[PDB]
Amino acid sequence: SKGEALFTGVVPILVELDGDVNGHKFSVSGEGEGDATYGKLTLKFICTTGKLPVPWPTLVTTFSYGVQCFSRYPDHMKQHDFFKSAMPEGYVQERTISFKDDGNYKTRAEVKFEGDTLVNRIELKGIDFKEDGNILGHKLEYNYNSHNVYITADKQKNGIKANFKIRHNIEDGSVQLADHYQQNTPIGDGPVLLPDNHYLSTQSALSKDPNEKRDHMVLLEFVTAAGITH
C-alpha cells in the first residue's frame, strides 16, 4: 500500500512537544530516525526551555510510543498496521496517562509526514500532581522497562484504541504505575487498516550524550507487532 512504502528505508523523525504540568510550562525538541524494517528508533530530545520539570522517562511514550508507525509488523500481520496505513496524511494520537496515586497527563499529538520527515507534534497537559510525589519530586530512575501495547480497532472513528501499563522504576526500588489509554484517528482521506486485536512488544533504552550539557534524553527503542500467529 501507499503508507507501507514510505517506511521501507530509514526515515528522519522530528518531535516537538509543548507541555504544562501543574503550571510548569516547558518545550522539548527531538530528532532522530526510524527504520520500520527492523522496528528500530533512535532519538535525542532536548528541553529547550531549561530544566525539564518532570522526569524524562515519564515522556517516553508521548515522544515515541509516540511514532508507532515505526513498529515492525511481520509480513503475515501487515493487514493490521493502522499506523502506516494512515500515512502520509497521518493520524491524531490522544492519550490519558494516569500515574497511580498521583496526577495525569492528557496528550494530543499529530503524527504525519512533512516532506520526507516524519513529524510528531504534541501538546501535553498535566494536572493533579503531588509536589513531593514521584513525578514533581524527581524520584524516578533514568531507565525503562519492556512493555506490551494492546491494540484494538475503533471502527466508529476509522481508527484504533490501545491500553497498556507502564511501570516506572522508583529510586527506592518500588514502581510507579502509569496507566495508558490511547486513541488514534486518521487525518487524511485515504483508506486505513482496522486491525484485529494484537500487541506491540516494546523495548526502550535511555542514555545520556556525554557531550551534551542541556537537559536531554537519548532513546533507543525496538518495537515489534505480535499476538497473531502465521
For cell 491500553, the residue is: 163
* Contact call for residues 80 and 73 (beta carbons, < 8 A): yes
- Total structural domains within the chain: 1
User: Cα separation of 124 and 141, whole Å?
Assistant: 22
The number of angstroms, rounded, from the C-alpha of 71 to the middle of its chain's C-alpha atoms is 11
Written as nine digits, the cell of 12 is: 528522519
Which residues span the domain enclosing 87?
A: 1-230
User: Cα separation of 173 and 166, whole Å?
Assistant: 16
For cell 530528532, the residue is: 31
Resolution of this model in Å is: 1.2
Alpha-carbon dihedral sign for residues 88, 205, 25, 21: positive
217: domain CATH number?
A: 2.40.155.10
For cell 510525589, the residue is: 133
- What's the first-to-final CA gap in the chain, in angstroms? 20
